[PDB]
Symmetry: D2
């Protein structure tokens, strides 16, 4: 007897060419569809509308990289400088994505949805519940940006989605109202790009556990770029400078007789 | 006083927003550019033309997934079924990409560029050198497809770039001429999709060591999809069936006294 | 000039690396072993001789479980794809988590919670576990049972009780639960994961270090499988189609955009 | 019809279908009860052979010496980066392990490879060996140290060589060859000593481990340290790491306006 080891629903390569949710890639190309549509097929088994496609495109472009200093890029750079090939080097950087690096996108969407359903018109109760049980509000706050120096990417994304699409964004609207409240207590408690993207993705009807995929995929663009960049330079193996390390170590000691 | 630890050329986040090869992502979005343009900027520090961008788009779409049975997808499925979160699960599948899984794109591009430079009008000489020093020509050959049943994705890509763009494609042209020679020897020695993509990328002036990025990035779309699919099904931990394993092990023996 | 990171366990600025203050060459010359270096780098304390003897056995017993489980099979898939050893083992290690290896840590965590919150209320523990967690980690086996006991559990429990002086409240608690659970169903035995998890908790190791023993031990096996496949010149793996349930969409034409 | 099954994979080293897992035919519980150790399980699973007591003592010392080299090197630092990003231990250690390869750890394998080739191709021709290395490789792997020299040798090398020659009967042709090479190279330049990577690489080759298994000792040993660093960072509740900007040479494009799409 032979029972299947796994079950798949999204793709199939047993036919003439691979099929994404029933559609051939070459036919998707010939009829004008794009990367964003293949994302919808493989992650949601649904061809996105044009307005959804334009938003997916912009989220990925905006999320593609944040410079070499952050953990995902720097992990890929460390591996590149150790002479590791591209896929394995990028896998090391991608391993950094989780609760602290990228997690604000998923978490902001998760809790701003919970606020929409459990505190529809009780923002102080939401902030109060967050203050006791979570701490800082995911998606709110910036070290440099403020009300009079807002994030241009948030401005653009909010402007594009409200002026160039007809999409209903309950979570984003809630976050935008929270921004009005939070900026009162402290001026730098703005809606940041992670909260904006996290709320928009929740409003686009993607499964909750797929939301991290947009950050993972986008930052893979940057991590590949950094691997290529380090290989273009013939970079050498990295050792962190000693003065950058607080060696709070035990004093040198003699091993006791066994 | 402090020698820099690393050098980066492709991106910077010290300004108002991240800059990709000098360009702000929000401004790229507002002026109609896409994911494919961000790929060109971060992997080659050059803005693609519209025709180049259309080709990059199609390469990523065609490469996004090849079903759950191949090593990259299956590695991500194994990790998903072990309860591993999406970024780490995809990183395990990505680790499978290398000389045997995905490697044909890079090798085809490398050797067909060498053919354009060392055998400009000497296809028999190129094929002769390949058999001596390499063996089979990467990008040539297919297990099922043949001259009278070619790969529809190759047909499409070659047709699109020939008829819908004015790009000069010496590597692709060389491969298409080689196809005439090899198919004259054996009907199934057609130009395959890996060879087509590898040659086109070289003709787009991407570095040889960047070619793999297109496969790594594209297959990340599918690996994310498979992770989502397995989580939608609540699949269980996988153990390979014993009848699928040839246990060519030592006979059980008693441990000798020490 | 503010430090980027802070470390407390090791230092290589001297003549040789120092593990919790001790030089490795000196540890070697005075008769210490791998288990002692584990204690220094994970707990900044030299183990007692009995602690080292237990650590040694836990690692030996956990080193491998055959090629069919997710960690080894992940390393084998990577080996057959031509990936080098460290990266191939990294793919197998990525499989270790709540379902593959996690029972060791969870058994330790919940049997500690039972010892402190239900010292003489096993039904309250079993009831609370069934309500809030589900199956008891470390209990149950698909093949082993009262009729087919586990030799490694027999050995480990026997070694602890007859060859050491260690007090093992967590392991003792699990052994009492085993008496209750096996009465319901013969296969609800204390398994090897539960045995090791309880012992590690009883040795006063930090709770978040417990997974290290499984991670380290199975790295031995994953390296072995990588070597084994490379000795055989194995080829790239593709899962057989008949092993996959393709519950996919029907082939469809793409709609005009 | 019915499916005709052909095995997907073949294994020779281990089997869990019996009463307990078998490592090259031996039960771990029985290995434990008869006094064997971690080093013996390493020998079984990587080489399908029970080590002798002296081979086991050498394996033990190699692993202990290789367990960690501080937090600044790439493997440890990768595990630290992932720990400070909140990643769980197995995945964090996997990120540091990904750094191990031709540049980080590779000197052990390269030293073993080329000093065995010297034993087989230049048995009594050290100058010929050095000449070939300069032409085809460059510096001799396992020779040289930036700080240590003949006046300040590596104590771990001294200890390992002393232990093997005074506390065991092992024949170490590769190690012996390297020790003679050291005499020639140190005459050229005082810091061209035999370093710990060359010592371990040669000893492992002399233990009859396959060349492609040599990296296993570094991978396994440094997993001990990488686990330790993950635990250490979690004990401290360290924060997400961002490399300071002044540590980065931003040789980037100037800020530019995006051209209109044509
Ligand atoms: C030796 O190869 P054979 O035993 O002939 O095997 P095979 O049938 O696969 O090869 C037939 C021909 O196609 C060639 N060939 C086979 N596969 C490929 C390939 N992937 N790329 C290019 N040429 C190929 C072989 O070199 C041979 O040509 P030759 O007679 O000029 O040397
Ligand atoms: C740099 O400072 P210099 O004093 O010029 O040293 P340099 O790098 O030129 O090497 C000096 C000598 O040591 C040798 N050498 C340098 N590094 C190594 C090494 N890692 N292993 C072996 N020999 C080495 C060189 O080959 C040269 O010897 P040679 O003249 O016989 O070829
Ligand atoms: Na930056
Ligand atoms: Na709205
Ligand atoms: Na053709
Ligand atoms: Na098995
Ligand atoms: Na390899
Ligand atoms: Na290797
Ligand atoms: Na057996
Ligand atoms: Na853990």
């Amino acid at each position: 007897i032979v029972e299947p080891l796994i079950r798949t629903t999204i793709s199939d390569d047993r036919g003439e060419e691979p099929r994404y949710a029933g559609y051939a890639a070459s036919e998707l190309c010939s009829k004008g569809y794009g990367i964003e549509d293949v994302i919808g097929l493989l992650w949601n088994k649904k061809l996105p509308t044009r307005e959804e496609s334009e938003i997916i495109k912009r989220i990925v472009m905006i999320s593609a990289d944040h410079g070499p200093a952050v953990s995902g890029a720097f992990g890929s750079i460390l591996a590149a400088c150790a002479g590791i090939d591209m896929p394995q080097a990028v896998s090391a950087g991608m391993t950094m994505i989780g609760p602290r690096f990228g997690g604000a996108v998923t978490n902001a969407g998760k809790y701003f949805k919970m606020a929409v359903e459990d505190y529809p018109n009780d923002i102080p109760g939401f902030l109060s519940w967050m203050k006791k049980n979570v701490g800082p509000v995911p998606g709110i706050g910036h070290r440099v940006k403020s009300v009079k120096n807002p994030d241009q990417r948030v401005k653009y994304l909010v402007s594009y989605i409200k002026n160039e699409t007809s999409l209903h964004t309950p979570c984003l609207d809630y976050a935008l109202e929270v921004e009005k409240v939070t900026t009162a207590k402290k001026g730098n408690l703005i809606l940041n790009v992670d909260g904006t993207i996290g709320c928009i993705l929740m409003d686009l009807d993607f499964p909750v556990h797929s939301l991290n995929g947009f950050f993972v995929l986008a930052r893979t663009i940057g991590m590949i770029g950094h691997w290529i960049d380090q290989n273009n330079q013939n970079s050498r193996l990295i050792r962190l400078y000693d003065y950058l390390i607080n060696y709070a170590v035990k004093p040198e000691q003699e091993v006791p007789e066994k």
